């Protein structure tokens, strides 16, 4: 009876689409209050940031560092890099460029909501991977991102918490 | 209802008081019960022990479980009679002439009323005087 696959004991939430990653998992029904596309964009953004963050945090701790290191930037762990970057100015540089990108993203999201036709999270850069492939595979790739993205959020959260809770080597 | 309840409770109490006076203690009981000097002194020691509290909770459960019937009767939705809890395990009065059931119930009432009055002396006399089979008070001596 239109039951969510994820929750076999609960009616599948309406207002949801049939897009990739739609397993009917919206117990609190956030979709009722906020357009789905906006939500999809958010999920991707959060996850894509987390995926990248995990890699960086781990690598820095493992030892991979820019060779011409800046002042300090040595004997510093991922847990302690933020402040160092701030004073060095690296964080400022990143914030500036990231914020600029977010501005253009704002324009993008608005157009998407107005009906431009932009798929949530699609900015056009595919490296040619999606070039030539049919919807079947296109959707498959999208689903794979989504799965990785959701998993990544759990991963990053754990690494950070554990690390601070138990100062130590990469495997905490 | 109150008369019956009071009577039943009184009869029960009288028996217990004497049995305890005779020394009867729970089968498998321990020092707390054995040490008790006299029924007149049991209440305080037991409340201190906490067992009295336990009894209260149990008794309360019984009260609530059985009292609701009165409301039903007042509502006029039931025709139960006073004191009728349909309790006759040994069937003493099962299949008995109504007249006989009447004499039986009267017998209960009579014994109950007697017990209620009985408990009074079993309490006041003991408090003023001493506990014994007669539970008398030293006339010449002080009582309180």
């Amino acid at each position: 009876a239109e039951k969510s696959a994820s929750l076999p004991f609960l009616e599948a939430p309406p207002n949801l689409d049939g897009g990739v990653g739609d397993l009917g998992f919206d117990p609190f029904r956030f979709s009722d209050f906020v357009p789905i596309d906006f939500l999809r964009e958010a999920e991707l953004k959060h996850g894509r940031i987390c995926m990248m963050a995990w890699l960086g945090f781990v690598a820095v701790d493992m030892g991979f560092r820019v060779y011409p290191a800046a002042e300090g930037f040595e004997s510093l762990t991922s847990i302690t890099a933020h402040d160092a970057a701030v004073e060095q100015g690296g964080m400022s540089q990143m914030l500036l460029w990231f914020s600029l990108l977010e501005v253009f993203d704002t324009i993008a999201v608005q157009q998407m909501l107005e009906g431009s036709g932009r798929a949530p999270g699609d900015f056009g850069l595919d490296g040619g991977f999606l070039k030539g492939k049919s919807q079947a595979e296109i959707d498959t790739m999208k689903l794979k991102e989504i799965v990785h993205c959701r998993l990544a959020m759990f991963a990053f959260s754990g690494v950070v918490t554990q690390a601070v809770l138990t100062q130590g080597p990469f495997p905490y | 209802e109150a008369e019956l309840k009071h009577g039943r409770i009184a009869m029960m109490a009288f028996a217990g008081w004497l049995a305890t006076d005779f020394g009867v203690r729970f089968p498998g009981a321990g020092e707390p019960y054995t040490s008790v000097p006299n029924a007149f002194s049991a209440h305080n020691i037991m409340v201190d022990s906490g067992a009295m509290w336990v009894m209260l909770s149990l008794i309360g459960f019984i009260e609530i479980s059985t009292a609701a019937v009165l409301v039903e009767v007042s509502k006029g939705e039931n025709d139960r009679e006073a004191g009728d809890f349909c309790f006759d395990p040994l069937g003493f009065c099962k299949g008995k002439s109504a007249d006989a059931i009447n004499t039986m119930k009267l017998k209960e009432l009579q014994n109950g009323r007697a017990a209620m009055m009985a408990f009074g002396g079993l309490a006041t006399q003991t408090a003023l005087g001493g506990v014994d089979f007669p539970y008398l008070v030293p006339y010449p001596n002080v009582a309180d």
């Binding site: 929750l7 004991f9 609190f28 | 479980s65 609701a68 039931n78 009728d84 349909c86």
Partner: protein
């Protein structure tokens, strides 16, 4: 019926039905006839089931720890009352205890949502969550099992309360306390 099996001196609970699992016609205060502040028989039914299930697991777990000792990785808790033991581990590895609570909160919230909506829609039945739903068969078995669930659940509830209260005072293990009384 004009009478109840448990209480043969008062009329039977109207809403209560012998068909319902665990029916014995025992509702002296007529709590079944409640439909306010979001509470109804459906809620009551679900509540009894949850209490029973939780209580059953609790008694088993406490007994297991006392009888077969703490699990691998958990050796800080040596108390046999299963009350200080909790505190022992809470002072050793509070993370696992707290973490479990976090997951429970989320699960419980979804459960509440399902109960609310399910009750209104009528699609769900009190106690159903899907687990081992296929286990029973013929439905008669389901009913029997059901009744049993409540049967041991009610018993477990009393037992569970005893352990939590007793241990909070005797400062000794439940099994050993039983032994003392029997010794």
């Amino acid at each position: 019926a004009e009478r109840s099996p448990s209480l043969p001196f008062m009329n039977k609970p109207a809403l209560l039905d012998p068909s319902m699992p665990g029916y014995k016609g025992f509702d002296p205060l007529g709590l079944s006839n409640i439909d306010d502040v979001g509470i109804d028989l459906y809620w009551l039914r679900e509540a009894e089931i949850k209490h029973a299930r939780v209580a059953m697991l609790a008694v088993a777990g406490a007994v297991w720890v006392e009888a077969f000792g703490p699990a691998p990785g958990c050796e800080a808790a040596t108390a046999k009352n299963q009350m200080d033991a909790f505190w022992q581990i809470w002072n050793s590895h509070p993370q696992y205890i707290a973490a479990s609570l976090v997951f429970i909160m989320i699960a419980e919230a979804v459960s509440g949502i399902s109960t609310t909506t399910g009750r209104e829609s009528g699609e769900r039945e009190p106690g159903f969550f899907g687990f081992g739903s296929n286990f029973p068969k013929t439905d008669a078995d389901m009913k029997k099992m059901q009744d049993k669930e409540l049967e041991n659940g009610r018993l477990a509830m009393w037992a569970a309360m005893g352990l939590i209260f007793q241990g909070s005072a005797n400062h000794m293990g439940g099994l050993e306390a039983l032994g003392a009384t029997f010794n």
